[PDB]
Write a protein that binds this ligand. Structure first.
Ligand SMILES: [Cs+]
Ligand SMILES: [Cs+]
Ligand SMILES: [Cs+]
Ligand SMILES: [Cs+]
Ligand SMILES: [Cs+]
Ligand SMILES: [Cs+]
Ligand SMILES: [Cs+]
Ligand SMILES: [Cs+]
Ligand SMILES: [Mg+2]
Lengths: 193, 193, 193, 193
């Protein structure tokens, strides 16, 4: 049952005519053995967004080994830059995933360490509005208390009579799932041996 | 016999004035010993497309090793991201090629495995219309039954009286060619020894 | 105390309504044991800049090992191209940092060698103006006498009653800090052993 | 003597107000021991070009090891994609250089082999016009007889009374220079031992 028709029209949202929401929370949990920070990003019901892309910054004041204090310092969280998976094809809500690896700022952050960290994730979508011919930027924010450790996003997408429908009342909904409380670094150590 | 004149005008489509089609099917076959998924993408007879680029997504529901079910999950099929061969110079139909390697989702997919897979390839061209000064997105789709294994695209381009002409009646046409029925992974294994 | 609200509005510049300055000087100094060339770049008080990015060129006449003289030759100074840290989220002044490594043109340049070099750094920001829907380019320049060796930028950002304020009278201000007078290459050599 | 003023205005073309030409020929010759294909690209006297970038394609019909004939097949010639040196700061004519290495299509092409090759280089600049707020594409072409082996571009840039002037009558001019007649591959072989 096709997601996209041969002519490029999408079988989503029966009877559409082709403000953008981010999930209120972010989740952390395992996917294929890798620990992932994930948040959700909705489509615009009534228009495509050409050249869509997602990026995320980490706002976190820091001190260099030489004592320079950098308030609200920015660093770029990896959400598919290298493989071009940041280039979105937004035609229904997507879970964006940041794999927490050796280069990720969350490498050394455990379930317990987490609420003691003072940091904020800024998510930024940017694209051109299909109809409007204009460049949009949509932004949102997550702080330490809004990253739910050990959770996943409820799915929202069902197939009904040859179109795909979105239950937007589940958009922000998440559920709990068995998930180690160790930091990614620790997990790596433990696993390797 | 020049494809492009010193002043930048192209010797294609005698008497042009400078809707975009994708081939109805995709083909898989060997090119220089590498197995390739290929589809074709036409130009617009009557205008250049500045900053053209092609990308492709794989729509395929999946289950993580932790049992999270991701319906119609997206992953980015490599069509020249790294070398900038995705940056198209569209002035006649082009065969876009995805080399099926260790990173490709088709790595483990044989001729027989193929029709049993439930997946869909979304192709998306994007550029600015030379004349119209506006950002376009053109899309199309291939499902398992529309990828012809062991085929190639008929050529369409002939040189006639100092211009190059396109036989658009061959645009979607393909022909059969000797092609192993083994998956790319298998071919690799076999070859290496 | 949030930098960005859940709805994407920023808590910066109480009572704003959402010309761009570069710092007059550049500084060189250690950050986390790496030697860095840094300059500062302000926001526009009264509008966001979508798709912001920074690049920098090195203007420096040179002679090839074959005696070709290239006047005012250009080479690209690395300011976060690879990790996408050049993709700015400009909502207050940012210190842009170029880590002076083996690929950097300053690799072999010491504190003493510096004023004897005849070179110029061109910095170029580019983005779309949130409101104006138009592509802007802002440029500035640093010459040998405008790179202060052994300095850092004064911070400018303070938190006041739930908004963040910018002391623009400190924008261009810098202070001295203990910093080795050896070139990056030399430091590397010395350290490694 | 500044190339760019602190406020971002350029000291080029006294009394300007801020059609684009490519050199008629391309040259091949050594730069710092590496063999380089080079062509020249002028600025627009009377406007900046924001977000400028250069790419080049190789048009060359080919036959795969499986006998598929691909007429006027395209492949992307590397002109600074990886280091972002393709991102031009066009404010006077620039020599664009493609280093002929193991990945370059000219790797195996000698001075003698050259005129027997049937190939064409398409060069494409793209950017937004500073004033006009519009996306431009400028194109040109080089065929085998227009790549002068063993040459260099005459310089065109002189400094006069605090502005830099361009002698546009030298734009297309080139001069001969001692240059080995061996292919890049061959040179590599020879040198390594
Ligand atoms: Cs990238
Ligand atoms: Cs974008
Ligand atoms: Cs890329
Ligand atoms: Cs594009
Ligand atoms: Cs990049
Ligand atoms: Cs940009
Ligand atoms: Cs790139
Ligand atoms: Cs561009
Ligand atoms: Mg653009």
């Amino acid at each position: 049952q096709r997601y996209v028709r041969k002519d490029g029209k999408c079988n989503v949202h029966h009877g559409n005519v082709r403000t953008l929401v981010f999930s209120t929370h972010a989740v952390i949990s395992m996917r294929d053995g890798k620990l992932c920070l994930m948040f959700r990003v909705g489509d615009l019901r009534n228009s495509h967004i050409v050249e869509a892309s997602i990026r995320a910054k980490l706002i976190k004041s820091k001190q260099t080994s030489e004592g320079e204090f950098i308030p609200l310092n920015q660093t770029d969280i990896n959400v598919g830059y290298y493989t071009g998976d940041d280039r979105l094809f937004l035609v229904s809500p997507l879970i964006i995933s940041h794999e927490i690896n050796q280069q990720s700022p969350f490498w050394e952050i455990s379930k317990a360490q987490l609420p003691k960290e003072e940091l904020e994730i800024v998510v930024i979508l940017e694209g051109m509005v299909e109809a409007t011919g204009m460049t949009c930027q949509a932004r949102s924010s997550y702080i330490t208390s809004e990253i739910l450790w050990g959770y996943r996003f409820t799915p929202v997408l069902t197939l009904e009579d040859g179109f795909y429908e979105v239950d937007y009342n589940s958009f922000h909904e998440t559920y709990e799932t068995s998930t180690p409380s160790l930091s990614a670094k620790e997990l790596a150590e433990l696993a390797n041996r």
